Point group: none
Chain length 76, copies 6
């Protein structure tokens, strides 16, 4: 029983961008407040907890062009 | 039982960017406050906890062009 | 039972960037405050805890172009 | 405004007993077992707790004649 | 405003007993076992706690005749 | 405003007992076992704690006749 696989993907894909000018970006929130309360925590597996974050983020890239791929060949 | 696999992906993909000027980026939040309260914690496996963060981030790259890939060939 | 694998990925992918000028980036938060309270902690495996961080980050790279890959061939 | 109280209770009450013979009293339980489990306890006032008793009592008095009273005169 | 109180209780009360013979009292339990488990305890006032007693009592009085009283006159 | 109190309780009360013979009192429990487990204790006022007693008591009085009283006159 001969088995033959030829996994040969091609890609020629350009992600481009042009922006004239980034500027005058203000970010001035008026504060904030968090409060959490509990008694016991029992974690057991691959838990990803977050309890009480107060983020403030200003993310100004001149690019930002993302390109994700994923290849998975499986055999049994 | 002959088995033959040819895993041969090609990629020619350019991620480009052009930005004229980055500037005048202010980031002036008015403070903040967090409060957490608990009694006991029992962790057991691959836990990723965070309890009470107060981040402030200003991330201004002139690029930021990300490109992620992943290849996984499996055989049994 | 002959088995033959040819894992031969090619890549010619350029990640480029052009930015005219980075400048005048202010980052002036108005302080902050954290408070955490607990009694006992029992950790058991590969725990990644963080309890009460107060980060302030200003990350201004002229590049920032990331490119991640991952190859994994497995055989049994 | 004259006020006059005359609190004058009388009592002539006899509590008697006659028993011919006390004897041959066996008390042979086959053991026992208790198990309690909790995390936190917060008590705050005039609490009367009991957690996990395993009493075995043999109380053989030749008398046992109890006589309780209570008098309370109150004025405002 | 004349006020007159005459608190004059009388008591002639006899508590008697007669028992011919106390004897042959066995008390042979087959053991026992207690187990308690907790994390934290916060007590705050007039608490009367008991945690895990294993009493065995044999109380054989030839009398046991109790007689309790209580008088309380109050004025304001 | 004349105030007159006459607190004059009388008592002629005899507590008697007669027992022919006390004897042959065995007390042979088959052992026992206690186990307590905790982390922290915070006591704050008039606490009466007991944690893990294993009493064995044999109380054989020929009398045991108790007689308790209590008088409390209060004025304001």
């Amino acid at each position: 029983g001969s088995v033959q696989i030829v996994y040969k993907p091609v890609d020629l894909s350009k992600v481009t961008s042009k922006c004239g000018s980034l500027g005058n970006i203000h970010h001035k929130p008026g504060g904030g407040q968090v409060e959490v309360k509990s008694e016991k925590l029992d974690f057991k597996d691959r838990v990803q907890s977050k309890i009480g974050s107060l983020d403030n983020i200003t993310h100004v890239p001149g690019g930002g062009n993302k390109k994700i791929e994923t290849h998975k060949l499986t055999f049994r």
